[PDB]
Design an enzyme around this catalytic site. Structure first.
Site, PDB file in Angstrom:
ATOM      1  N   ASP A 526       0.845  -1.186   0.000  1.00 27.33           N
ATOM      2  CA  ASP A 526       0.000   0.000   0.000  1.00 27.33           C
ATOM      3  C   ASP A 526       0.882   1.239   0.000  1.00 27.33           C
ATOM      4  OD1 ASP A 526      -2.260   1.641   0.092  1.00 27.33           O
ATOM      5  OD2 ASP A 526      -3.269   0.340   1.544  1.00 27.33           O
ATOM      6  N   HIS A 529       4.673   3.764  -3.714  1.00 22.25           N
ATOM      7  CA  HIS A 529       5.361   4.821  -4.442  1.00 22.25           C
ATOM      8  C   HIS A 529       5.939   5.896  -3.532  1.00 22.25           C
ATOM      9  CE1 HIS A 529       0.927   4.651  -4.851  1.00 22.25           C
ATOM     10  NE2 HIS A 529       0.967   5.816  -4.229  1.00 22.25           N
ATOM     11  N   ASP A 627     -12.757   2.535  -1.576  1.00 24.60           N
ATOM     12  CA  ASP A 627     -12.455   3.934  -1.291  1.00 24.60           C
ATOM     13  C   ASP A 627     -12.951   4.834  -2.414  1.00 24.60           C
ATOM     14  OD1 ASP A 627     -10.025   3.864  -3.233  1.00 24.60           O
ATOM     15  OD2 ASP A 627      -9.523   2.355  -1.720  1.00 24.60           O
TER      16      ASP A 627
END
EC number: 2.4.1.25
Length: 1532
Positions: A526, A529, A627
């Site tokens: 999660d 990056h 989400d």
């Protein structure tokens, strides 16, 4: 399962870096390393970090792989190292260019998963991910019901939220202590530890084949936890990075101001009203700015900095012992890292200012001027810095105002309303548990590292820049933008530059990660990056070391695929998640489905040995996310079925969460949720709120969809097909290449509600090709009567008013919803079925399992059996036959035993001879014009360029699929001849008839497959029928031999003279026009152009040397003997005719090619062992042309010894004939005036001369017929006198004659030539000695000022060059640098010394050699022309009518001889030059191979000018340009 081994070829070049290219290979695939076309002739070492099997994997350890040569030779063309991958990871490989790094790459290997007790391999094409949350799971004891519900839903993969202690926020991904079970998931009666969770997970996996995937968090942690109690080094604190002090001060000031305003203080002055659609936004912004601006203390900081600077300047005093260093003049005085050093003790360097300004003297005035200038400069710098940062501050303020305005006026936002303490308008950037600064404790707080160590920090991300940049770099400016968004409990985690900073913390985190890995097989990433790459790489390496098999799933929103590809290559990501919410209509959804993997229907078969090509990373087609806004509220409630039927038919993956099983009319929020799930209860329940049955309205459809997806994944469907005609016509038509079954699914309209939006009853009719066999899916949506939905405060219940019914195994006739309108036949082999839409309600989907024609399965089976009977590439695919063809058992095996060159080289490609001799109306590329006539290589060049890219949209494929006239034309051309050609034509016709019963018109794929098979068998049977030289060499030698063999051909009109009847192995054929038996001997020519056709197919020295090369490399001894006999029979007066007209035509205008023929026959005799039996064989001369017409052959069979003796006698005496029936009334360029028959034979010198001013005896012919460019009178540029190579050939001939006479062979050394009445008995030994002395004396020009006994020393252009034509002639005929001396030393290197010749060669080869060949003229020459254009007509004399043919253009036959001579000299000189010669030779052949690779005609170009021009004007292939290359390859 004996799957065929796969070998991948990878080419490494130094001209590019391979860092963003996919390199995914599984364990079964084998990767091979090749030197590369541009790296030939160089030795390099390959280093890889891949560990040996059975040993622990080390990232920092590298190993070297040795080089093995399969051919056991010194050639570097075939040099690869075995590398059998057997593990999954991110191993890095690189090669070193001796001592300097050049480049590298990454290798990605996919993982494997074991399912059940059988540990069967599960392909990554039938996995349905299911998302589960620990918070929704309730108590740990109540877990069986949810697992049973998930199993009944039909999901083989379950996402499990990690179970760990959470903070007071009660939010996901906010674990506090990752060392014990969550107290919430426990009861006082029974406590469950990690062992219980692990055993439950393993029991679920073993008994229900469910794989669980967990999550790992590294960039964030709970604000309050027991992990940190005494060591603040775990999280980033102010003591670690004290440079961000103003940011902390501003954040604390803003927080204090917000707290003061909220607590009923800034109300009397004024409070803004509610924001509406008016000008109130400007007033709000102004009222915000009027208090934000005074809050900043930039002016105070600037003034205190100025005060400290002036105080330091006053305190500092000039020192007599001052040292000044020479600074860079281009350097400028700048101030950097200002907040790096704290105030009251900061140190700065003044030497830059001292170097910038040089004082005039040491007087007080100069010092005052210098200090004033320095103060002015520093003030200007401060003003410039303030101006620069003012714009940044204004931009940050504007961005913050816009963000807060969007948040306060967000339609889809939470819309909290009034600002409260629990929900502040702006989230605090940093947490300060201690009391805020009020009066004077700021100074104490600053000077207190002990208290500042306990300070905590948060983390956040901004969606306006790439998060790949490290956030731990000093002087960070991202936080100053005031755009960071952070949660109320997340805390940033700092790991440092190296793990050695906190070894204990790193060890503890590694142990936690390995415990998680050994407790949960799966893992997920999660926000990968944003986290630093080194720590994640270390954790993945540790997990791979502990667990050999691991599954990693991650997603990114970078947009472009370059970042995703580089992350996959570096970290080792195997699966990707893509959101399907980006599709707002049918067009975008169809484009996403088509582009997300798959291939178009109809493709060829990739070769087993193919170069490596980039791949596409796997992606997951998730339905909805946890989400984002729910599609149920935004769109219609009937859109669930089309989405499920689209993601089920996808070629990449499928999956859904718990929110899609039940069509609840609300959005699930992770942050705010207390309700539990629904307990499993199979039927026997009203199913009101939490007692749902096994499957009522949505569960059965989901189970059917999952079963269909699993069946499709197991079947192995890769093909995809998407077409769009109207707004809702989306369909999927995957086709299996093995069994040829296609499934078509038809959707309906679901985006618009039928009640809310008006709809038209009439619908377009879709025609489905083929006949429907069985309807595998039938879902109908209806509306029933039920109690209205009510909100529940205990659990979540879906809407019970929507339900569908499924049906399986229903015939079309028995179907009561759709009916068969009729059968339409639009073509002889096309079957179309019509279906009428009667009661198909919107939102209802149906899938049709169509079937092919009844007479198709047997044809497909027999075609597959025939295809697989040649090579084992086609696995299985065998169908039983009834009778087949008993007569035909070995169609190609039988033809392997018997083979001939004439028939093999007649139907290869039919490039131009057949078209130019008979014509067939060939249509080349019908769309554009006419490009590629018939050549298989022409289409192969495009195929090899489009196959790696999978570009099926090329126009060539479109016009190949448009019609099948190419097959008919090929068959007609093949059945034109008789015999073996007729048999093979009949075989291809039978194959075409067999394969002419297939649908979809995918014939070109089978045509390409059978062409590949036929080419493979032809290449094999040509390799077997060859000498033992090409097998030992590399593939370049085989390719050159194949090209040389394919060059020859036989036309309708024979070109070679009729052989004598006494000759053996004389081919014969029957003419198709005259119906007469004529010889079909193969005539060698420089290609097959339109200029030469039969009459011009034969030439002199070029054809002679070409035939010598081919028939001394291949090994055609009998053909060489026949050619020699024919040449001897057609020889007249010991001179080569140079032009044969198959009759009275004869042009004896040249005296050359006799010594070449003698050398050719002598080397043929010397190469063939036991060749003494052919010298005494009878010779039957057939063309006696002395004083009358030739008589028919067979009159005499005298030996050739007397013939050659008479020819030598005539040459010594001379020939003075006249009117040799040449040019009776035709004259275009040659001029026949005066006397020109034969000149030469000079006494007392041992040299032979020749040539005339108006007659050309050499092979030079280039002139223009234009009046302006009229250059007649002198034919080309004749070389009067000795021609260098002729002297060497004569020396070799006399040496061979003397050697033969020394062993009683050829005992006619005495010469009976009589002149002026006296006979001389001079032997060849005296002549050989005289010619050797002449060569050693005359041809010894010295660059140094010596050798006074020389003639015209100043006439030569320069010293050190070799004369081209010795004698008295024009100065512009022999004083040029030409490669005519290489042949002289090649035939006989004894004359040339080992030192003078070597130095001459080195000084000659300095700027002549080019990319492909040496220039015919020296670059420093004023008449050199590197560009040749015959069609061009300019005012340049050298560029008029192609006058620069030999003035800069590079040929191909001069090269090779120089390399051979250089290597021969280096062999006897020293080993030092041998390596250099070998490297140069390897480079030359590498460049030749590179040039020949991109050859549409598969021939060597003859017009290789500068800058690598295209479209040569002359012939694109030459027969005489391959003998030198073959000889060079044989030498080395």
């Amino acid at each position: 399962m004996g799957h065929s081994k796969q070998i991948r070829i990878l080419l490494l070049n130094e001209m590019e870096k391979l860092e963003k290219t996919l390199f995914r290979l599984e364990q079964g695939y084998e990767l091979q390393f090749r030197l590369g076309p541009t790296l030939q002739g160089k030795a390099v070492t390959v280093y890889t970090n891949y560990p040996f099997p059975g040993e622990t994997f080390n990232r920092e350890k590298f190993r070297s792989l040795d080089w093995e040569n399969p051919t056991e030779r010194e050639d570097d063309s075939d040099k690869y190292c075995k590398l059998n991958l057997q593990q999954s990871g991110s191993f890095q490989y690189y090669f070193l260019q001796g001592n300097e790094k050049s480049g590298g790459g990454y290798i990605v290997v996919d993982p494997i998963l074991r399912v059940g007790a059988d540990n069967h391999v599960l392909p990554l094409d039938c996995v349905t991910l299911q998302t589960f949350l620990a918070k929704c799971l309730g108590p740990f004891d109540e877990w069986e019901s949810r697992l049973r519900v998930a199993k009944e839903s039909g999901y083989n993969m379950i996402h499990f939220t990690p179970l760990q202690t959470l903070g007071l926020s009660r939010s996901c991904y906010s674990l506090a202590n990752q060392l014990e079970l969550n107290p919430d998931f426990s009861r006082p009666n029974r406590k469950y530890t990690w062992n219980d969770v692990g055993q439950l997970v393993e029991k679920l996996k073993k008994e229900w084949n469910v794989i669980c995937i967990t999550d790992v968090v590294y960039n964030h942690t709970a604000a309050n936890s027991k992990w940190i109690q005494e060591h603040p080094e775990c999280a980033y604190n102010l003591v670690n990075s004290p440079h961000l002090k103003p940011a902390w001060v501003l954040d604390r000031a803003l927080w204090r101001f917000s707290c003061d305003v909220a607590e009923g203080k800034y109300k009397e002055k004024g409070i803004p009203a509610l924001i509406e659609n008016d000008h109130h936004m400007n007033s709000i912004r102004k009222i915000i700015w009027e208090d934000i601006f005074p809050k900043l203390k930039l002016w105070e900081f600037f003034q205190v900095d100025v005060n400290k600077a002036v105080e330091q300047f006053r305190r500092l005093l000039t020192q007599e012992n001052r040292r000044v260093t020479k600074s860079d003049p281009n350097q400028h005085l700048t101030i950097i890292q200002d907040p790096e050093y704290r105030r009251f003790g900061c140190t700065v360097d003044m030497n830059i200012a001292l170097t910038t300004f040089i004082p005039h003297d040491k007087g007080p005035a100069a010092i005052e001027e210098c200090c004033n200038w320095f103060h002015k400069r520093m003030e200007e710098l401060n003003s410039e810095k303030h101006r620069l940062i003012n714009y940044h501050q204004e931009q940050a303020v504007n961005c913050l105002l816009g963000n807060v305005f969007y948040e306060r006026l967000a339609g889809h936002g939470p819309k909290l309303g009034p600002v409260t303490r629990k929900h502040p308008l702006v989230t605090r950037y940093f947490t300060f548990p201690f009391e805020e600064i009020d009066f004077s404790m700021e100074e104490s707080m600053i000077h207190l590292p002990n208290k500042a160590c306990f300070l905590m920090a948060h983390n956040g991300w901004v969606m306006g820049d790439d998060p790949l940049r490290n956030f731990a770099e000093p002087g960070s400016e991202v936080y100053l933008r005031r755009e960071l968004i952070c949660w109320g409990d997340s805390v940033k985690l700092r790991y440092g530059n190296k793990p050695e900073d906190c070894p204990y913390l790193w060890a503890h985190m590694k142990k936690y990660t390995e415990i998680t890995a050994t407790y949960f097989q799966g893992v997920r990433l999660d926000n990968c990056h944003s986290t630093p790459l080194h720590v994640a790489e270390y954790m993945l390496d540790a997990a791979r070391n502990l667990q050999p098999n691991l599954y990693v799933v991650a997603e990114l929103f970078t947009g472009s695929e370059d970042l995703d590809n580089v992350f996959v290559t570096r970290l080792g990501i195997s699966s990707l998640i893509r959101e399907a919410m980006s599709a707002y209509n049918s067009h975008e959804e169809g484009r996403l489905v088509y582009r997300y993997g798959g291939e178009p229907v109809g493709s060829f078969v990739q070769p087993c040995l193919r170069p490596l090509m980039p791949a596409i990373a796997h992606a997951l087609f998730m339905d909805i996310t946890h989400d984002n806004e729910c599609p149920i509220v935004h769109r219609s409630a009937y859109d669930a079925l089309p989405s499920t039927t689209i993601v089920s038919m996808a070629c990449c993956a499928s999956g859904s969460t718990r929110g899609y099983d039940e069509l609840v009319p609300h959005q699930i929020s992770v942050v705010s949720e207390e309700r539990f799930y629904t307990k499993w209860n199979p039927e026997a329940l009203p199913s009101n709120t939490g007692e749902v049955n096994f499957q009522s309205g949505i569960i059965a459809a989901r189970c059917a969809i999952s079963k269909l997806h699993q069946e499709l994944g197991a079947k192995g469907f890769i093909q995809v097909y998407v077409d769009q005609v109207d707004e809702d016509i989306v369909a999927v038509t995957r086709h299996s290449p093995s069994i040829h079954q296609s499934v078509v699914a038809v959707s309906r309209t679901a985006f618009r509600n039928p009640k809310t939006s008006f709809y038209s009853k009439e619908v377009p009719q879709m025609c489905i090709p083929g006949k429907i066999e069985e309807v595998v899916l039938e879902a109908r949506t209806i509306e029933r009567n039920t109690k209205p939905y009510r909100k529940d405060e205990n659990s979540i219940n879906g809407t019970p008013d929507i339900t569908v019914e499924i049906r399986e195994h229903i015939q079309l006739n028995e179907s009561k919803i759709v009916k068969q309108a009729g059968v339409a036949t639009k073509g002889p082999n096309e079957y179309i079925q019509e279906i009428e839409f009667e009661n198909l309600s919107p939102g209802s989907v149906i899938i049709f399992r169509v079937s092919l024609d009844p007479h198709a399965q047997v044809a497909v089976g027999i075609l597959r059996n025939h295809l697989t009977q040649f090579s084992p590439h086609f696995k299985s695919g065998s169908l039983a036959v009834d009778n087949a063809d008993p007569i035909l058992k070995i169609p190609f095996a039988s033809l392997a035993s018997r083979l001939t060159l004439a028939e093999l080289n007649q139907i290869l490609y039919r490039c131009e001879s057949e078209e130019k001799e008979d014509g067939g109306g060939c249509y080349d590329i019908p769309n554009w014009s006419a490009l590629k006539y018939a050549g298989l290589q022409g289409l192969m060049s495009v195929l090899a360029e489009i196959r790696p890219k999978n570009d099926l949209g090329h126009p060539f494929c479109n016009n190949l699929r448009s019609g099948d006239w190419m097959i008919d034309y090929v068959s007609n051309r093949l059945i034109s001849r008789s015999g073996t050609i007729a048999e093979v034509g009949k075989w291809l016709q039978a194959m075409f008839f067999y394969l002419k019963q297939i649908p979809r018109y995918l014939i070109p794929c089978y045509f390409d497959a059978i062409l590949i098979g036929a080419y493979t068998t032809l290449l094999d049977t040509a390799w077997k029928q060859m000498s033992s030289f090409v097998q030992n060499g590399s593939t370049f030698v085989k390719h050159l031999s194949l090209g040389s063999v394919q060059l020859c051909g036989v036309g309708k009109f024979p070109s070679l003279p009729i052989l004598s009847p006494a000759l053996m192995d004389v081919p014969y054929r029957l003419n198709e026009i005259t119906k007469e038996k004529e010889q079909c001997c193969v005539s060698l020519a420089a290609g097959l152009p339109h200029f030469s056709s039969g009459i011009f197919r034969c030439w002199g020295r070029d054809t002679f040397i070409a035939l010598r090369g081919i028939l001394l490399i291949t090994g055609r001894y009998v053909e060489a003997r026949n050619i020699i006999l024919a040449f001897a029979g057609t020889l007249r007066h010991g001179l080569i005719p140079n032009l044969l007209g198959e009759g009275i035509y004869a042009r004896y205008n040249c005296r050359d090619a006799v010594w070449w023929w003698l050398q050719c026959i002598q080397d043929y005799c010397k190469m063939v062992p036991n060749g003494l039996d052919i010298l005494k064989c009878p010779v039957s001369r057939m063309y006696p042309t002395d004083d009358s017409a030739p008589l028919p052959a067979g009159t005499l069979d005298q030996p050739l010894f007397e013939v050659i003796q008479e020819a030598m006698q005539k040459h010594m005496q001379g020939i003075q004939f006249r009117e040799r029936n040449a040019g009776p009334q035709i004259d275009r360029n040659m001029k026949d005036e005066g006397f020109n028959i034969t000149a030469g034979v000079d006494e007392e010198t041992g040299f032979v001369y020749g040539g005339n001013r108006f007659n050309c005896g050499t092979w030079m012919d280039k002139m223009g017929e234009s009046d302006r460019a009229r250059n007649r009178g002198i034919p080309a540029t004749p070389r009067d006198g000795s021609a260098v190579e002729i002297v060497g050939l004569s020396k070799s001939a006399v040496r061979w004659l003397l050697e033969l006479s020394k062993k009683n062979i050829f005992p006619y050394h005495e010469v009976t030539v009589k002149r002026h009445g006296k006979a001389i008995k001079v032997s060849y030994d005296e002549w050989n000695r005289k010619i050797q002395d002449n060569f050693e004396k005359l041809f010894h020009v010295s660059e140094d000022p010596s050798d006074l006994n020389e003639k015209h020393p100043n006439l030569v252009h320069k010293r050190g060059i070799y004369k081209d034509s010795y004698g008295a002639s024009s100065p512009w005929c022999d004083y040029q640098l030409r490669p005519n001396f290489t042949i002289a030393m090649v035939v006989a290197p004894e004359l040339f010394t080992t030192e003078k010749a070597w130095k001459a060669l080195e000084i000659a080869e300095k700027k002549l050699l080019g990319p492909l060949g040496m220039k015919t003229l020296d670059p420093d020459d004023m008449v050199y022309c590197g560009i040749y254009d015959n069609a061009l007509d300019n005012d340049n004399y050298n560029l008029a009518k192609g006058f620069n043919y030999h003035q800069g253009p590079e040929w191909l036959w001069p090269i090779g001889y120089f390399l051979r001579a250089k290597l021969y000299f280096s062999r006897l000189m020293g080993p030092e030059t041998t390596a250099k010669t070998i490297v140069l030779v390897k480079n030359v052949l590498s460049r030749h191979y590179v040039h020949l690779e991109r050859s549409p005609w598969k021939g060597l170009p003859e017009l290789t000018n500068e800058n690598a021009q295209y479209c040569p004007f002359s012939c694109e292939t030459q027969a005489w340009s391959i003998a030198t290359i073959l000889e060079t390859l044989y030498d080395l």
